[PDB]
């Protein structure tokens, strides 16, 4: 059945890096308000804003110390209320980031929990006595080091999947769950339009927290088999839905690593799924194009079978830039557009991450002091102590680190690319002199205007929202081609995902080119497409 959230195009803002309105180098809510014309003109329907709640910022808002107050760096609740009012008067919607696997260690519940074994908040978090004079088990944090941190006062360890300042909440405690549901409903009562639900596949821990294998005798071992998508999680997520989301006309997208296309039914089926869609991570870990076709096609066909719906994306605040990960910096403009048509025109709701629509790319800062990510700074400290060299650590940070997606948004060629009049919290990528909103708005051939046109064709042609996906030319190691079919219309999406010229055989009573990123050759025959590197074309056929 048709739904507003299926038809939408979403845009993800990382507010610390979107727009600084007051010169302190930190993006803020009045900065977002000042750029709403940009998003409305792009054609965005839904804005997902990353966390904006009170936080010490050990993990840039994902360590929350008050769920009901706004981060001071970003503004006040009055600024939030102005943002939501202006978004809604522009006919757009706003979803917030719901972070309920863990809190800050400065949240009042944790300050109480850590104070005594008998404090009434003790069991709001995950506490355990050590084993053999060390931690309760051998589990590694996702941000490196142990997943357990010792409290000298009470002589027990608390669990943190993420940073030492992000103690995990104990979802086995009914009192925790009840306080969380009241908080979620307090936000929904304000008239927000839903949530992106952070780290939500991590809320169930294997009981007893058993050690995992360690044949290499590492200090700690990766611990996803102890806490990622574990049996028992669905009971908690079904109750979360019944007590909160199901009471409101909203959209939910869960961040759900560890879910595969054949295990997705309980997450996203129309009949009984806990969210409307999830971010799945199987495609985010020459490029093996056939492997990518396999993953994305498994999710297109798999969710069509269960009446689920895909969240389509190639970028977010936790990944490197998609030109580097999936395209080519030697063909930056052409590959940015080719990737855009490829991912955006599958069946699902597309998400655009800030700067993806400009073709922004990874940065390379010379010094570890120029980086911020708690995960990579802890990785550096831990690996340096083990004897890894500075150079080998920097290669990991430069090639894989999510700070590549957190540099200031590139609005123009003024100081700091127009993101701030002060000293940005993270330096601007030097390539803003070439890559910026102002230059792209005036260039018909820009990446930005290619995204504007994708959004327009998807809105104008129902086949691009609701049409059935089918993979074409599966064994072609260069060409990713697929169709969308609805009634008497078929759209053909052709993407030459290679840095070479290629030829491709086109797979009706009328044919139209809907978008293309190279000039068309009038002598070219439809039958024998001669594609340039990273050339994409979308055709609409009337059957
Ligand atoms: O609030 C903490 C943290 O949560 C969100 O992202 C984290 C994911 O929840 C978490 O699973 C982990 O992702 C890893 C995948 O599990 C793994 O399969 C593969 O993709 O590598 C990832 C290593 O991180 O980590 C991410 C954080 O990187 C949230 O969106 C983050 O901003 C936040 O820091
Ligand atoms: Ca600011
Ligand atoms: Ca040609």
Numbering used by the authors: 2 to 286, 295 to 516, 521 to 556
Article, verbatim:
Bacillus sp. AHU2216 α-glucosidase (BspAG13_31A), belonging to the glycoside hydrolase family 13 subfamily 31, specifically cleaves α-(1→4)-glucosidic linkages and shows high disaccharide specificity. BspAG13_31A has three domains common to GH13 enzymes: domain A, a catalytic domain that adopts a (β/α)8-barrel fold; domain B, a long loop connecting the third β-strand and third α-helix of domain A (β→α loop 3); domain C, a domain formed by two antiparallel β-sheets that follows domain A. The maltose moiety of G3 and maltotetraose (G4), covering subsites +1 and +2 of this enzyme, adopts a less stable conformation than the global minimum energy conformation, presumably because of steric hindrance by Asn258 at subsite +2. We solved the crystal structures of inactive double mutants, E256Q/N258G and E256Q/N258P, in which the general acid/base catalyst Glu256 was substituted with Gln together with the mutation at Asn258, in complex with G3.
Crystals of E256Q/N258G and E256Q/N258P were prepared by co-crystallization in the presence of 5 mM G3 and G4, respectively, and the structures of E256Q/N258G and E256Q/N258P were solved at 1.7 Å and 1.5 Å resolutions, respectively. In the analysis of the co-crystal of E256Q/N258P and G4, the electron density of only three d-glucosyl residues covering subsites from –1 to +2 was observed. Structural analysis of E256Q/N258G and E256Q/N258P in complex with G3 revealed that the conformation of the maltose moiety bound at subsites +1 and +2 of the double-mutant enzymes was different from that of E256Q. Torsion angles of d-glucosyl residues in subsites +1 and +2 of E256Q/N258G and E256Q/N258P were close to the torsion angles of d-glucosyl residues in the stable α-glucan: Φ (5-O, 1-C, 4′-O, 4′C) = 102° and Ψ (1-C, 4′O, 4′-C, 5′-C) = –120°, which is considered the global minimum energy structure. A molecular mechanics study of maltose suggested that torsion angles of d-glucosyl residues at subsite +1 and +2 in the E256Q-G3 complex are less stable than the global minimum, and the conformation of G3 observed in E256Q/N258G and E256Q/N258P is predicted to be more thermodynamically stable than that in E256Q. This conformational difference of G3 presumably arises from the elimination of steric hindrance by Asn258. The orientation of the side chain of Phe282 in E256Q/N258G, E256Q/N258P, and E256Q differed, presumably because of the closely located amino acid residue at position 258 (Gly, Pro, and Asn in E256Q/N258G, E256Q/N258P, and E256Q, respectively). In the E256Q/N258P-G3 complex, interactions between Phe282 and the d-glucosyl residue in subsite +2 are absent, whereas these interactions were observed in E256Q/N258G and E256Q. Moreover, any additional interactions through the N258P mutation were not observed at subsite +2. Therefore, the stabilized conformation of G3 likely enhanced trisaccharide specificity rather than increasing the enzyme–substrate interaction.
